[PDB]
Structures are given as structure tokens and as C-alpha cells.
């Protein structure tokens, strides 16, 4: 009786898979049927999704079905191909081959879109659509893809915490009648604030006061043995132009002379003028440190610095600044540094009136002689058997002395170039501030930081106070301060800008 041949079925489309586009097309399939009693013209048949397709064997054993519905191949992923053959006698046989293929009607649409914005979705996969009736689908994150009258799909991208442990890739799958699915993957991108540069200005008033000569007198003291106060002499302290007692000495000399203080006024250099908002030397303070028998030294002394101030109509006003010194004539040991005597000046002040304007003269401290730019200190240290000399520096300020010239602001306001943009995350604060052009998140917000001419306190809410500490004589024309600040939003995005302060003199 007849002998069966070999039937084989080629791949169903190139990838042996029926996809969502092929679903709606007519698919040709093909194969071969050879051997046994198979012959050209033999019937080939197959049932796919309960539909019957047939053809005949052609020369070379090739068989081909012109058009099988993609929907049938999607519904039926495995089928037999059966060829019916006959031999000489007329005996029949059937030869069976098998075909399997995959079915995947899905398609992906992948997007990377900014949070907190509406976006038209472009380059969607071919055939993408909503099932009829549907005009909106809700995403995994609670976003929405909406179909508009213009045929465009719009995604409302939610705001996300891009710093936490939860993925910010949104998704949704649309399923259609015919079995197709479309998975839209929407990688939500983080938004950020935009810091905008800020401009502020401050002008330091530069008034000139007409003043008389200074008279400096040691007026009181606590403790001490053999204490004497006197007008300076060539041998003890040097001479000055008045009879006030600028010298004070104390102690029972254990080696030679008495310890003490001298103060030579600056009448000659001042030339009868004070300047507002300017560190001024009122004179030269000398500490004369000799060894004296233990216990014999003062522990404090007070000096009155008296002068008159003229107003704009030739009327003089007397002013007395009281200057207080704490003295430590330390026990002498075999350590020179430990044996130094220490003088500490208090930061006292006196307020006066001129032409109805109130001014305060305040002690700044001691400064090294001849160095107007030197550091000003309030304690000085003198070796035994030595004398040290320092300018006694004051500053005259406007008002009651509570503060220096200053200006205020908020770096989130429009300060010349517009207000800082906050982004979609919100919770924006200032997290760094620094003098200069470079800033990172740091530990200076809410602290006082030193600039070139003054100090800045910038707070996390953007509020700032800048006060000018430099003397008027140290502020060149066109002087400016630059402070860089860094803002940061809820999930770490940072932006920096510059607060520039024009520091002028008048």
C-alpha cells in the first residue's frame, strides 16, 4: 500500500510570530511535500482556527497558501498540514507535517517626559488607539492619557519624588477588541528650581566732624600699691600737648621701675577731624611691663577721653568716652609666655547729639602701630621687662550703636532680574551660601559669614541681612560684594545664583 512522504512548514512570517500588525493582514504560508507516493498535484489541506485552507503540491514539492487570515493564525498557533496521495494500485495515504508559531499582539510605546506638565504623545506605534467609547485611560501613577478632538493623545505627568526608593516610570496597557495591547511606558523626568541673580545696594555715609584736641585722663582704678597718675614726661611715657594725666604707674619695683600704662593722644595726626564709619586712632596706648612684688598691681583702671564736637553752626559740644581696662599682672614663672601681663579693653561707648542727629563713639580695640589695615584685638600680652604699643581705635556710628549700616532682602523676590523659579516639586529652601562664586550645600545658612566689606546672614527662607563692617576708607569706588547661594527642592535638585551688593560711600 501507498507510502507517506515528508511534509514541512516554513516559519510563519520571518520571526515565526504573529504580531499586532500582522493580525490585520493576510499571511501567505508555505512549505514542502516530498517523498513516498506524494506527487505533483496532490492535495494539501490544513485547518487553522476551524477554517479550511488548501492547495496542491507544485513542481519541486513546494506548496503555498496564498492568503491565510492573520486573525486565524493568531487564534490557532499550531496546525497540521496533510497531503493526500495515491500510488500505482490507487491505494491512498496521507502524509502529515506539523507547524507551531508564537502569537504576541502587544506593542510598546516608550516616552521620557517632564513631571508636572502636559505632553502630546508622538510617534505612537502603528495602529495605536483606545477601545471605542474610551477617551481617557488612567496610568499606574494616577496620570491620565486623554484622547482629544484633534486626535492627539495627551499625558498629564504627575509630580514625583525622584529621590526616594520608588520607580518613577509610569505605565498603562490599553487592550483592544481584536486582542492587541499597547503598553505605554512613561519615564517621568525630574523638574528643578531656577535660581535668578539678585541685586542690592548699600551706601555708607561719610560725614566729617570738626573736633577739638583730646584730653585723656586716668580717672580711676582698683587695687594697686604706690599708684601714681601724671602728665607724661620725657622719661616716663613721653610728652603731650595738655596737662591731663595720661600716665599711670603701680607696683613696688622688684627690679627697676613701676609697671603701668601711658596714652599719647593723636591730636597732631587727627588735625581736628573725625570721620563717620571710619576706624580712627585716638592715640597710642603703651603697656609698660616691669617685674613688681606680688600683689602690688591694679586689676582695673578707667581713662576718660574728652573732646568737643562742632556742629554746622559753630556750636561746640563736650563729649567724654570712658575707657575701661582690665589688668592682669600675672605671677612670674620660668615660662616667658606664662609670665606676660595681659590688658583687656572693654567695648564701651558714648552717644552724643550734633545738629539734631545722634551719633555713637565706640571702642573698637587695640591695633598695631602704623598698620591701618591690621587686625584689631581687645586683649594684648606683654613680656616682663618690655613695653608694647598699640593704637586705641574707635569708630563713630550713626544712632545708638545697636548696628552697622545694613541692607535687607529676600533672594526669592524679584531683585532686578526676576524671581527664582521653584519647579514642580516645591519645598525649595536655601541650603548653601558662600562668599565668592562657588557654593555647595553647606553649614552657613542662618549663620553670619564674612564677605569682603561686611557680613551676611542668609536664611533658609531666602531672607538676608548684610551689614558693612569695613571702614569707609577701605571701600574703593565700584566696590561690590558677591555671595553665591544654592536652593534645593523636595528631591534634591539644586540651582545656584549670586547676590551682588553694590557697596558705595557718600
Amino acid at each position: 500500500e501507498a507510502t507517506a512522504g515528508t511534509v514541512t512548514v516554513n516559519a510563519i512570517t520571518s520571526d515565526d510570530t504573529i504580531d499586532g500588525i500582522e493580525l490585520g493582514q493576510t499571511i501567505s504560508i508555505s512549505g514542502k511535500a516530498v517523498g513516498g507516493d506524494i506527487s505533483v498535484g496532490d492535495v494539501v489541506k490544513m485547518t487553522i482556527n476551524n477554517t479550511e485552507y488548501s492547495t496542491t503540491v507544485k513542481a519541486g514539492g513546494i506548496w503555498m497558501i496564498a492568503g491565510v487570515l492573520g486573525s486565524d493564525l493568531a487564534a490557532d498557533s499550531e496546525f497540521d498540514v496533510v497531503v493526500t496521495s495515491s500510488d500505482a494500485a490507487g491505494n491512498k495515504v496521507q502524509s502529515i507535517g506539523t507547524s507551531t508559531h508564537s502569537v504576541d499582539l502587544s506593542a510598546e510605546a516608550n516616552f521620557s517626559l517632564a513631571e508636572g506638565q502636559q505632553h502630546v504623545l508622538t510617534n505612537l506605534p502603528e495602529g495605536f488607539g483606545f477601545p471605542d467609547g474610551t477617551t481617557e485611560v488612567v496610568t499606574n501613577f494616577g496620570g491620565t492619557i486623554t484622547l482629544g478632538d484633534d486626535g492627539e493623545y495627551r499625558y498629564d505627568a504627575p509630580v514625583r519624588d525622584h529621590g526616594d526608593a520608588v520607580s518613577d516610570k509610569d505605565s498603562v496597557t490599553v487592550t483592544l477588541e481584536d486582542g492587541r495591547t499597547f503598553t505605554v511606558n512613561l519615564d517621568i523626568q525630574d523638574s528643578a528650581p531656577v535660581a535668578v541673580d539678585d541685586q542690592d545696594s548699600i551706601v555708607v555715609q561719610h560725614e566729617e566732624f570738626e573736633v577739638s584736641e583730646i584730653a585723656a585722663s586716668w580717672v580711676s582704678y582698683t587695687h594697686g600699691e604706690s599708684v601714681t597718675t601724671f602728665d607724661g614726661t620725657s622719661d616716663l611715657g613721653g610728652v603731650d600737648n595738655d596737662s591731663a594725666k595720661d600716665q599711670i604707674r603701680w607696683g613696688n619695683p622688684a627690679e627697676s621701675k613701676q609697671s603701668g600704662y601711658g596714652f599719647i593722644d593723636n591730636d597732631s595726626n587727627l588735625e581736628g577731624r573725625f570721620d563717620l564709619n571710619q576706624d580712627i586712632s585716638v592715640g597710642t596706648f603703651t603697656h609698660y611691663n616691669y617685674p613688681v612684688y606680688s600683689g602690688g598691681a591694679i586689676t582695673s583702671a578707667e581713662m576718660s577721653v574728652e573732646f568737643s564736637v562742632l556742629d554746622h553752626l559753630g556750636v561746640s559740644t563736650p563729649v567724654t568716652l570712658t575707657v575701661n581696662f582690665d589688668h592682669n599682672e600675672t605671677p612670674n614663672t620660668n615660662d616667658v609666655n606664662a609670665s606676660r601681663d595681659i590688658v583687656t579693653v572693654q567695648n564701651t561707648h558714648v552717644t552724643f547729639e550734633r545738629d539734631g542727629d545722634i551719633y555713637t563713639v565706640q571702642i573698637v580695640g587695640f591695633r598695631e602701630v602704623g598698620n591701618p589695615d591690621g587686625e584689631v584685638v581687645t586683649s594684648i600680652y606683654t613680656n616682663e621687662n618690655a613695653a608694647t604699643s598699640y593704637e586705641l581705635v574707635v569708630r563713630v556710628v550713626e544712632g545708638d550703636g545697636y548696628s552697622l549700616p545694613s541692607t535687607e532682602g529676600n533672594i526669592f523676590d524679584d531683585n532686578g532680574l526676576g524671581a527664582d523659579s521653584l519647579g514642580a516639586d516645591g519645598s525649595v529652601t536655601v541650603v548653601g551660601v558662600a562668599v565668592g562664586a562657588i557654593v555647595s550645600s553647606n553649614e552657613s545658612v542662618g549663620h553670619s559669614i564674612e564677605g569682603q566689606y561686611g557680613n551676611l546672614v542668609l536664611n533658609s527662607d531666602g531672607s538676608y541681612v548684610y551689614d558693612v563692617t569695613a571702614s569707609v576708607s577701605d571701600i574703593p569706588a565700584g566696590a561690590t560684594e558677591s555671595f553665591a547661594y544654592l536652593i534645593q527642592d523636595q528631591d534634591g535638585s539644586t540651582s545656584s545664583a549670586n547676590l551682588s551688593i553694590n557697596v558705595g560711600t557718600n
Binding site: G251, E255, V292, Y293, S294, G296, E329, P331, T333, D341
Partner: peptide, 4 residues
């Protein structure tokens, strides 16, 4: 000590 004995001196200051």
C-alpha cells in the same frame, strides 16, 4: 612666685 614672688614677682608679677
Amino acid at each position: 612666685g614672688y614677682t608679677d
